[PDB]
Design a protein around this nucleic acid. Structure first.
Lengths: 131, 135
RNA sequence: UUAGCUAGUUGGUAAGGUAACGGCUUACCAAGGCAACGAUGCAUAGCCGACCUGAGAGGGUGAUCGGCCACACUGGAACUGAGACACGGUCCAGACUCCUACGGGAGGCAGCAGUAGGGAAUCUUCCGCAAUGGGCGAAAGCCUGACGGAGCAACGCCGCGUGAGUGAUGAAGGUCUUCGGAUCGUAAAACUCUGUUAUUAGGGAAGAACAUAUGUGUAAGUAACUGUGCACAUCUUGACGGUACCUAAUCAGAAAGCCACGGCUAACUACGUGCCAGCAGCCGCGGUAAUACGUAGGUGGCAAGCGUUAUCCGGAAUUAUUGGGCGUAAAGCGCGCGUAGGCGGUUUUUUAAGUCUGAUGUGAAAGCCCACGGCUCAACCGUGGAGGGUCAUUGGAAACUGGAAAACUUGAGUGCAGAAGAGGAAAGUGGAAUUCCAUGUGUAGCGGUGAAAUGCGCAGAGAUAUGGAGGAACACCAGUGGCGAAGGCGACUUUCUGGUCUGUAACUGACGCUGAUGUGCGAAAGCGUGGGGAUCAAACAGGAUUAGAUACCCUGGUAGUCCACGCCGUAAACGAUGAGUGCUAAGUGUUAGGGGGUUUCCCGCCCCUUAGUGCUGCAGCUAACGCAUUAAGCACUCCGCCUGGGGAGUA
RNA sequence: GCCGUCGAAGGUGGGACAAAUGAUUGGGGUGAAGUCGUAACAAGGUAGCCGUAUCGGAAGGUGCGGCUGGAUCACCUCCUU
């Protein structure tokens, strides 16, 4: 029994940061593919590659590292976790690190970065910051 | 703790206690209960004036007095200043504040408001100890 | 440390009653209802818009002001009236007070004052309806301790001046001086302007004042502005108050102090004093040279206010949702089974409850904030705006949470082959050791202390040799080695019985995790019931040491240690590390397995995979020590718990 | 005007709870350099601690089970260049 898959993926990502390995393996999901795509679109992910085998996943991602082998982010975590679910309006939506970081948020029309979610004036349930 | 474990109990505090345990005054008369009347100061009749000494490392003959208050309770309070114009049966106004000489006394009277007359032996702290401005 | 409450209660029928529905009340029938999502009780308390604080979330309060509720010496009741079961109405009962011819009768300041009493402490026994608003009147007008206004408190906020400029001689004088001088200090004196404010004389008697009735003239209605119902004009109204304010004249002359000066915290010198007197919010000063006591000078802060006290918030992240921790510092209960609850694998469809989004109504006003305007400015007031709901209705979205329906297996569980294990119960078996007894041999000793002593021994000990009885745990094996959820499990054989892992993967298709309350198990000791007691061993006896030893020491020695059934229900019950799940460098072993290659045959060898079981260690983490795949790392869910020590696990 | 129901106040009775009081009494906090003995802190001079039992003026002791948070010595076995 696993209480939360997003917690698993973020722990895998951070534990990949602490030792620095380009490749990681994790059971995929539709929300997982979408958030991985947005991670690549921010610039934190070098490449994305989904695979299929019995049954789900398994999502293989290619990390990114600086020329001097410097980790891009300085921290990464979620906000909406079980028990205490959270939500966020369009105006109240938080600017974490302003432009620096972004705020993944799931909306009635789909998951997008923090920006577009405040541009369109449609909020939603936040999932995880990243910075 | 976990959020639901915090929902089903009111997150209890460490509620403090008072420093003047006779800041409170019981029902004066026409009643037996003790009111919660609060005050910054209480008057009282002094049934004996005495003198005691503090514990180590201080050494001095420190002057105190036991007083019966309006709420008919028994407290102790040391008289400050030079000279004391009190004795048994003397009424007196009382302030609040603890001294580290010895326990059983955690107040001190105010000099110049009640029978306790101010001492004019001072010229610097005149607004305390009842001294009036000299000319 | 408030666990059961409720009998008109709950439901029905019928009727009555109430403006109304209603056990609201009656009679009949029924036994339900309320309660861990906290009933009932107890204790306290009017509630709210808001106020204070805080960056914010929050915390505390319910003073003015407005809304709602409850009450009018205490208890009961009802008439009037639309509206009362009535604050300055009534009756009764009750307490108090008072008059009387003693027959009986009069009142209820939690209304304004004002008065007593209590307290630390909270004020005129004010003028008046000029305005606003009330009750009545046809109106004029009446009435109104509402209210307008005046007054007292430095109670609060704000502002306000207690002169300015020139002026050194560093005057005098005070203080200190290393005896030169320095300090106060342009400070003072003096010169020149000034009058904040004050004092006088005048004005204005300012605004707030709008008006009602009264005459001219006009529209609706009546046959008839004859008269009536409608808008203008002009006439007419100030307690505040002769105010506010203004003009002109005069004087720096009436108008300044409080706290602190060791650090926190800005501000030092002399003297007195010498653990005395005293200071003290904390750290702490002082027993003869106190920058901390007191005083003087000087200085800093602040100001018509200043300091103390009490109270509240912040600081306090010191209740931690934002924003805490639980190895050692307080904090993981002993553990187990599990209800309620909390949480939830993967995919599709669908609902749109949550969520997001728009509108509508509403969140009184005053208040906070913003912007502006007006009182000379500010305070203040007004205006308008924003803001404020865990708010209701309704239009849309469907990723996510949720509801429904349909699919999957990776979690959990089962299935087939296996592996091992001190896993639990009942019985029996073998031998040694021990104890007692008996016998033969056999003597002067045996026994014990660091030294001894006690004790045993001529009735022949010990011991030796033999055989016999007793009760009690099983030598090597034994290992950081395993089983068991902990507490535990080491003698063997059988009977019955619970668990664990690997492989398999065919199978059920989320059935899962945490889990309050509840239940059971639970070390040794202790207890109830009956036996047995060979040893060992609390209490106890002797001796010895010892100043003394009822302790350690030596020799005995009961309960007990044993069994059988119940009783209790704690522990440093530990890994001082809660359970479940996933991820993150290594090497080295151990226990029960599996796949593959090397060998004629692996059983000899190696690699790989498991799960526990260890160590060294990187990243990271920690007060550090240490943790490191058997995390105290990186996260999630759930449970338990802590908010200084002593008191005290005490009452 | 009488009678009937309800009806407060009042009296009677029994309980429940709260607060003061009370001879004495038990334990605790504190105070003079009080006396007795020194168990604990090191191998604390008999290792300590935890529970229970029992003894003792007392700190404490003892017995039984447990822990190291024990040291002089020494871990079966294992780790380390």
């Amino acid at each position: 029994t696993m209480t939360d898959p997003i917690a698993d993926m973020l722990t895998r990502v951070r534990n990949a940061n602490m030792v620095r390995h380009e490749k990681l393996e994790l059971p995929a999901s539709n929300i997982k593919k979408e958030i991985a795509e947005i991670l690549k679109s921010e610039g934190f992910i070098k490449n994305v590659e989904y695979v299929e085998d019995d049954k789900q996943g398994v999502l293989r991602l290619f990390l990114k590292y600086g020329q001097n082998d410097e980790r891009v982010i300085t921290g990464l975590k979620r906000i909406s976790k079980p028990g205490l679910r959270v939500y966020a309006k369009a105006s109240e939506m938080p600017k974490v690190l302003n432009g620096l970081g972004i705020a993944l948020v799931s909306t009635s029309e789909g998951v997008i970065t923090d920006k577009e979610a405040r541009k369109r004036n449609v909020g939603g349930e936040i999932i995880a910051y990243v910075w | 703790p976990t959020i639901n474990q915090l929902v089903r109990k009111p997150r209890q505090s460490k509620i403090k206690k008072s420093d003047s345990p006779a800041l409170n005054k019981g029902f004066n008369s026409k009643k037996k209960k003790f009111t919660d009347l609060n005050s910054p100061q209480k008057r009282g009749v002094c049934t004996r004036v005495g003198t005691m000494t503090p514990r180590k490392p201080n050494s001095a003959l420190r002057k105190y007095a036991r007083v019966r208050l309006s709420n008919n309770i028994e407290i102790n309070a040391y008289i400050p200043g030079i000279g004391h114009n009190l004795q048994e049966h003397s009424v007196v106004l009382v302030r609040g504040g603890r001294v580290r000489d010895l326990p059983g006394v955690r107040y001190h009277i105010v000099r110049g408001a009640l029978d306790t007359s101010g001492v004019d032996g001072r010229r610097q702290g005149r607004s305390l100890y009842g001294t009036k401005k000299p000319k």
